[PDB]
Amino acid sequence: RPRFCELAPSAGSCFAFVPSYYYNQYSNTCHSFTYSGCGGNANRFRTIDECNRTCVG
Numbered sequence: 001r002p003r004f005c006e007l008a009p010s011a012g013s014c015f016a017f018v019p020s021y022y023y024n025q026y027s028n029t030c031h032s033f034t035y036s037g038c039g040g041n042a043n044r045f046r047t048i049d050e051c052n053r054t055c056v057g
Helices: 048-055
Strands: 018-024 029-035
Touching: 018 048, 029 048
Parallel strands: none
Antiparallel strands: 018 029
C-alpha cells in the first residue's frame, strides 16, 4: 500500500460537497467518504476500483 493511501483527507479546509473514496488498510479495502474541492490529501479516490487496485495489497 503506497503511503499516499494512508493520508487524512483534509476536507475541512473549505466548504465543499464532493463524495469521494477512502482507503482503509485496517480492513484491506476502501469505502465511500465525503471530500472537498479545496484542501484534502491523496488518499481520496473517484472509485473503489482505483483505490483497491493501487493500495489493496
